[PDB]
Amino acid sequence: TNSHGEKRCTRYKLQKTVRERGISPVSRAIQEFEEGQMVHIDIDPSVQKGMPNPKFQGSTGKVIGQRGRSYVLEVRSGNAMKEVFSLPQHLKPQKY
Amino acid sequence: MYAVVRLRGQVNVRYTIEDTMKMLRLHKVNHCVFVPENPHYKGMVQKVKDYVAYGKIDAKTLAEVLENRGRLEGDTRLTEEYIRENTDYDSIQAFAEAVIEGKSSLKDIPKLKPVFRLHPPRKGHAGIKRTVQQGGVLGNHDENINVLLHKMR
Amino acid sequence: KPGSMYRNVRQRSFTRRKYMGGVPGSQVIHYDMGDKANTSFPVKISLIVEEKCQIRHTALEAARITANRHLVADTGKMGFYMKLRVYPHEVIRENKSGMRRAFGKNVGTAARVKPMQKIFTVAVEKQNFKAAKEALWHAGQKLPTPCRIVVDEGAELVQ
Amino acid sequence: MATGPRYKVPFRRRREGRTNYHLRLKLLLSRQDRVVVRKSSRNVQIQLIAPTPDGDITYSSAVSNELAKYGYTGATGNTTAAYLTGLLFGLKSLQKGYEGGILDIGLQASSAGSRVYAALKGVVDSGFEIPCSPEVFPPDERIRGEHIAGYREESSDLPEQFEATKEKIFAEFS
RNA sequence: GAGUUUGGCGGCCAUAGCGGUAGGGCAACUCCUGUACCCAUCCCGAACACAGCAGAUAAGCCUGCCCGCGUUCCUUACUGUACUGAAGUGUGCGAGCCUUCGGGAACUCUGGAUCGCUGCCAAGCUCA
RNA sequence: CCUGGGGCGGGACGCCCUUGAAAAGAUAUCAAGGGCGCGCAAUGGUUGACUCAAGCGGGUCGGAAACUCGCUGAAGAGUGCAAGAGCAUAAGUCAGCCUGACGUUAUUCAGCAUAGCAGUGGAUGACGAGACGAAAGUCGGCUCUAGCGAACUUUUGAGCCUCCUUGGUGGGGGCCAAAAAUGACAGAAAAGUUACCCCGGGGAUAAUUGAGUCGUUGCCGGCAAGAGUACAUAUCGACCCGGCAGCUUGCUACCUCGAUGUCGGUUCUUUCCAUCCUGGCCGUGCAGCAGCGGCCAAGGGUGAGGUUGUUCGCCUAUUAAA
RNA sequence: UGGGGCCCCGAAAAUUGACGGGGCUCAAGUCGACCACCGAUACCACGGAGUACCGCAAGGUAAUCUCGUAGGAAGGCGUUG
RNA sequence: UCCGCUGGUUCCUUCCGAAACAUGUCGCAGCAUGACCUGACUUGAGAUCGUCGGUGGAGUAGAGCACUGAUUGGCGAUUCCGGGGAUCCCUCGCUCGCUUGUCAAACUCCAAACCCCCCGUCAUCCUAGAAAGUCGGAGUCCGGACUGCUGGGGUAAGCUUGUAGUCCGUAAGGGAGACAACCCAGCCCGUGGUUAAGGUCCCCAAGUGUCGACUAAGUGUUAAUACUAAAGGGCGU
Ligand SMILES: [Mg+2]
Ligand SMILES: [Mg+2]
Ligand SMILES: [Mg+2]
Ligand SMILES: [Mg+2]
Ligand SMILES: [Mg+2]
Ligand SMILES: [Mg+2]
Ligand SMILES: [Mg+2]
Numbered sequence A: 001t002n003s004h005g006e007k008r009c010t011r012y013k014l015q016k017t018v019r020e021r022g023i024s025p026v027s028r029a030i031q032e033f034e035e036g037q038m039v040h041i042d043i044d045p046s047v048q049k050g051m052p053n054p055k056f057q058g059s060t061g062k063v064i065g066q067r068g069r070s071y072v073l074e075v076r077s078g079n080a081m082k083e084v085f086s087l088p089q090h091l092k093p094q095k096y
Numbered sequence B: 001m002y003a004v005v006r007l008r009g010q011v012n013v014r015y016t017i018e019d020t021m022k023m024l025r026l027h028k029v030n031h032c033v034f035v036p037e038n039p040h041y042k043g044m045v046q047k048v049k050d051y052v053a054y055g056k057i058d059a060k061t062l063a064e065v066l067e068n069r070g071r072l073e074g075d076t077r078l079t080e081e082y083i084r085e086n087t088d089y090d091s092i093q094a095f096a097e098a099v100i101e102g103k104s105s106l107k108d109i110p111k112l113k114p115v116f117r118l119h120p121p122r123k124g125h126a127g128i129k130r131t132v133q134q135g136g137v138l139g140n141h142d143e144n145i146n147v148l149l150h151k152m153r
Numbered sequence C: 001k002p003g004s005m006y007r008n009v010r011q012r013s014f015t016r017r018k019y020m021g022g023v024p025g026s027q028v029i030h031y032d033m034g035d036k037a038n039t040s041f042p043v044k045i046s047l048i049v050e051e052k053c054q055i056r057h058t059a060l061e062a063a064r065i066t067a068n069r070h071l072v073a074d075t076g077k078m079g080f081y082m083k084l085r086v087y088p089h090e091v092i093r094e095n096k097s098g099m100r101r102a103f104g105k106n107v108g109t110a111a112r113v114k115p116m117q118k119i120f121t122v123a124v125e126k127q128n129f130k131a132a133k134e135a136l137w138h139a140g141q142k143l144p145t146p147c148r149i150v151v152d153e154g155a156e157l158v159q
Numbered sequence D: 001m002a003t004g005p006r007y008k009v010p011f012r013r014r015r016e017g018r019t020n021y022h023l024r025l026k027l028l029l030s031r032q033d034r035v036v037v038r039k040s041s042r043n044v045q046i047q048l049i050a051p052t053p054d055g056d057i058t059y060s061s062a063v064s065n066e067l068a069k070y071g072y073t074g075a076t077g078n079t080t081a082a083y084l085t086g087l088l089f090g091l092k093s094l095q096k097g098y099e100g101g102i103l104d105i106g107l108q109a110s111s112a113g114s115r116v117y118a119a120l121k122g123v124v125d126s127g128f129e130i131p132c133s134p135e136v137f138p139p140d141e142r143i144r145g146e147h148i149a150g151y152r153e154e155s156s157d158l159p160e161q162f163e164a165t166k167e168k169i170f171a172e173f174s
Numbered sequence E: 001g002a003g004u005u006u007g008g009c010g011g012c013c014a015u016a017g018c019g020g021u022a023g024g025g026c027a028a029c030u031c032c033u034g035u036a037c038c039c040a041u042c043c044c045g046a047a048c049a050c051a052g053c054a055g056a057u058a059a060g061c062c063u064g065c066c067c068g069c070g071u072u073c074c075u076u077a078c079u080g081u082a083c084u085g086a087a088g089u090g091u092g093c094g095a096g097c098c099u100u101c102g103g104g105a106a107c108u109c110u111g112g113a114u115c116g117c118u119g120c121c122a123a124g125c126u127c128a
Numbered sequence F: 001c002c003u004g005g006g007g008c009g010g011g012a013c014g015c016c017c018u019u020g021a022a023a024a025g026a027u028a029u030c031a032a033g034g035g036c037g038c039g040c041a042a043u044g045g046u047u048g049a050c051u052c053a054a055g056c057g058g059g060u061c062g063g064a065a066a067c068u069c070g071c072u073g074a075a076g077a078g079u080g081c082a083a084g085a086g087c088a089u090a091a092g093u094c095a096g097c098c099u100g101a102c103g104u105u106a107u108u109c110a111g112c113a114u115a116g117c118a119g120u121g122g123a124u125g126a127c128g129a130g131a132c133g134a135a136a137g138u139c140g141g142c143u144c145u146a147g148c149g150a151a152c153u154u155u156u157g158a159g160c161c162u163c164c165u166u167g168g169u170g171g172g173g174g175c176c177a178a179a180a181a182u183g184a185c186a187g188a189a190a191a192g193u194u195a196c197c198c199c200g201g202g203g204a205u206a207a208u209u210g211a212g213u214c215g216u217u218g219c220c221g222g223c224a225a226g227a228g229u230a231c232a233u234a235u236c237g238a239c240c241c242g243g244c245a246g247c248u249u250g251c252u253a254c255c256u257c258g259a260u261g262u263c264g265g266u267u268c269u270u271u272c273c274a275u276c277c278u279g280g281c282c283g284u285g286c287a288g289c290a291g292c293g294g295c296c297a298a299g300g301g302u303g304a305g306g307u308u309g310u311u312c313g314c315c316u317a318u319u320a321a322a
Numbered sequence G: 001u002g003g004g005g006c007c008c009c010g011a012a013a014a015u016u017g018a019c020g021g022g023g024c025u026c027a028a029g030u031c032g033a034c035c036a037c038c039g040a041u042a043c044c045a046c047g048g049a050g051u052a053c054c055g056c057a058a059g060g061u062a063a064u065c066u067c068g069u070a071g072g073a074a075g076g077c078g079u080u081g
Numbered sequence H: 001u002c003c004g005c006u007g008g009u010u011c012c013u014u015c016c017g018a019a020a021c022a023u024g025u026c027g028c029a030g031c032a033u034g035a036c037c038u039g040a041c042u043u044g045a046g047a048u049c050g051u052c053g054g055u056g057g058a059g060u061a062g063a064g065c066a067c068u069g070a071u072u073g074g075c076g077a078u079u080c081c082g083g084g085g086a087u088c089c090c091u092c093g094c095u096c097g098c099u100u101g102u103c104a105a106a107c108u109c110c111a112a113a114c115c116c117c118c119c120g121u122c123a124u125c126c127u128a129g130a131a132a133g134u135c136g137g138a139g140u141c142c143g144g145a146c147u148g149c150u151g152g153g154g155u156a157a158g159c160u161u162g163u164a165g166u167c168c169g170u171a172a173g174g175g176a177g178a179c180a181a182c183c184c185a186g187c188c189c190g191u192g193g194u195u196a197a198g199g200u201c202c203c204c205a206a207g208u209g210u211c212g213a214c215u216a217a218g219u220g221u222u223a224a225u226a227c228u229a230a231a232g233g234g235c236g237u
């Protein structure tokens, strides 16, 4: 039977480009966001902790608040709203 | 400006194309609408090319269509007096020239229905299974929408 | 089994050696024929395919044998250089219960092709061109697809 | 070692071999300034650096060469020169507007009695807030004049010069 | 007050790498001289640490250059080719394929470019 | 219980990874590759110092089998165990110091897209105590995703509440957590036979009449390798390739279970040709007789008996042929 | 010699028989174009019914209202007391 | 008595109008919860079925060998790990490099067209009430077919199991000889008019129509289609 764990079908989803593997840039981890500021979900495989479920890959949410070193996002899946915790290392601003 | 005339019905049609059609005011075959020439309308017309014809319309055909098949709010025929007293242009021909030049629009006639309900094409058209380049009637016509529109006076 | 059982291309490829098991070997022994060390043949004709299909290795072996015999009989042992191109990488499986767990098991090997894709190639002199055409026409008779002959190099010489 | 398209080349500051990015990532998580105490043979350098998406802006940058105005006519590579540099840097940064941060020694061995910890002593004694512990602070016995006693007994004019430079550092920045 | 040089902390992370070659050290960095002290070796003052005057640009670092490998970019052809969204009373015995409107490669080809760009601060200076 | 009818076989009956799956998410089959129902006081935490696999050059029998020195080496190693992903001043190797393999508690995510569903897990946090480290920080086991179970019942740990008019003793009842198992893994204390069988339904589902297909079966074609004393084609015909019929057996489940009466023989009528004889032609390795091979032709003929239920098949004496 | 269009051989099945049938040969077949006409409840016009929404009523708007099984809802007809 | 199993269940019109799917189940001819339909009420301003531009996600088609597995010969050497017949007399396969010829569903240095989230714009809906919320009543969990995906399996099948769109189910009327789902069309009643699909020798309404060629076989006179014969040959034209 097929499994239904939390990392299924992520062979290429959670990979790094060949000229990207290793230590990722550190400035991406100290970026700071404010309220109501659209961001993009782009999971960085190099960081093991604070990773949202990879089904939210490539979605855009808005910041709602901060809990420690993690921002609270508001992502739409289908017709629902899902609140996703993610460290700022996996996030990326929207360029207007 | 464009001249979109619908020529195929609404059975066995995608829901995306149907919803674009209803956003263009076209609900029934032999119905016409006049829309400006901007990229939004250009794309919207490009998406329903296999159910409507279209092209550039001149002053004579537009004036004729307004004088023949123009209805007001409540199915009341449009006449010379309505144009000469509501707007400022003398007759239908001058107003048509102003509209085609872009110096006026059909919103300057109060209580005018946006949709024009024409007659089925006298003498018959080419056929609704081919585009114009294949010897049919669907798709872009360029300046030859006047021939089909005049045929459907 | 009959030839038409495994000739159409309807399903995905199935070629990874390390996942399947027990693929039987092949019969075609040598893929180069004739004078390999020569490189000065001015005419280079070839047999091409007109439709996608699958060719069993046995058909390729029969075609190679017949072309070899004809060419050696007429042109000579040192007057040509034949070279087969397509190698059989596909695998063929035959079910053998009914439809209960109908997935098959390996029975052979096949080589897929594509339209207008060269299969054989013969290089000869000017005096043995007709013999080359005669040889390549019999080889295409054992092949499971319509085939035409194209003179690739030295077309002005022959024509 | 670029031999093909799959080869992975390190960052520029890694090819130079003058940075450690894991340490840098651990340091930036403090949300607070950093004190850089990079040293050399002819002198020592201290400066306060904060991060930004473009680069690393710096607010204060004091160097041990600046003692020449005050009158520290001794060696610039000793521990006491580091203490003087740290002291004047601390006073300068306190008056400027900045007060605290984190100690960052980069790729250098953290051993008690070093010149880096001498600069740390000079910083802490000035009022510049900084988290640390006292056990690594070098004792003043080597601070004054006594880490060159055994080979330069003919030169023990240090302590009076140290006192004069300390009082002049206080005088200028107060 | 503008510019140059040197030094430190960095952003993009091979257009920056690999290899080759000719020049420079006055201020600065480095090499470089030893082991009283804090410090050190699974043995070694090699390294790290401390103390630093000598000599040197042979190395690190800096400037100029090289198409020789690798990477990035443009152009000629391949080619509007392969593939493909929508509609079709278009076509094949069949597995399939064709016409119109709209998108559009990869490798390879002729010829050129790429031997990093850039942010903050300090010091010596060089002007009015 | 699942099930290309049921049975037999197996478990696709719980959990984890890759493909199928058509570049967001979802997606079936007794689909393909598989694994798990554990092991470790160090194989765990933190700080410090380093770089691994494999080659090339040198050294004493240290043999193409040992250890050491120098060079190339972004990883070709290792990381407990499947598959996939991650990791180089390190998530790897070794040393020092330690036990965070801590007590309590709130949300959000997936299991269970969208869109309800336990228990139970994983990510952020909060309170109280610590380890390592100059500090920043890291630590809620072993880099990430598997290694597990409700209610009721018993046992164990800390402190309290309680037993019927009141107070005490012995003994019960309760709250919170941990352990004991339901593998058919969202949780019955559970073996067979019926041809002596009975009932309610089903073409929602099988024998075989029909329809579809043709692997197989019967009958042909293409190229001709070769044999035939020479000569591919008088005669036989390889390998490979392409078909026709529905006359054998398979495959499927479209019709029929409030019934379409099975095998063989007998009687009687008819149709097809892919010709056994009768009629006409062509070739021959056809002297004659008689043969061998092919073409047109369905008008007429095609029988009698022994074994066997037999179809089929063997045998006997005739016959133009049976 | 190569590349194309159509046709011929290859081509055998069981009641009598299926281009829908008759028939059709510079076509009543095939290929490339073209013209005129026929042909729906579609589209246009007129009259009528109902419905949805608004309005105190009169009445107003409807190209953007009129198919329908399981099923939900509203208003009416009939039998006995 | 009981059954999840079979049969029956009586008047008219009007408004709206599905699901044959997911999870749990001693569950598979049943049921519960959700999706989908309907009625009422609360609140009070936006919503996105569509177009264009931009910030992002791609790892499929195609293509290719740069990793992982395969794969064809020539050349030069591995003075090895190797098989042929006392200086291992010397032959020399496996292997390592330069060139040639093929591959991949569990390969990727590359890399589309569809598609998905968000911002702006146009466009449509909306105070005659958007989005959201609360309560009442259900049916449904035997589906089938056509056009795409070379979909997976299978020799194939009017076979079996998926997916996007649209249909039949529940869809009249017109045309296909008849045709559940193919083409035109989605339909209140009556009259007039013009057209769509398709047709115009007769059956049968309207052409024994026009222009330029082909076929001599009654071949053909058959959009799609479960209803239509192949390889090979022809000094037929
Ligand atoms: Mg059963
Ligand atoms: Mg008995
Ligand atoms: Mg019964
Ligand atoms: Mg009803
Ligand atoms: Mg491909
Ligand atoms: Mg039910
Ligand atoms: Mg359809």
Ligand SMILES: [Mg+2]
Pocket (backbone or CB within 6 Å): H171
């Ligand atoms: Mg319908």
Ligand SMILES: [Mg+2]
Pocket (backbone or CB within 6 Å): none
């Ligand atoms: Mg009908």
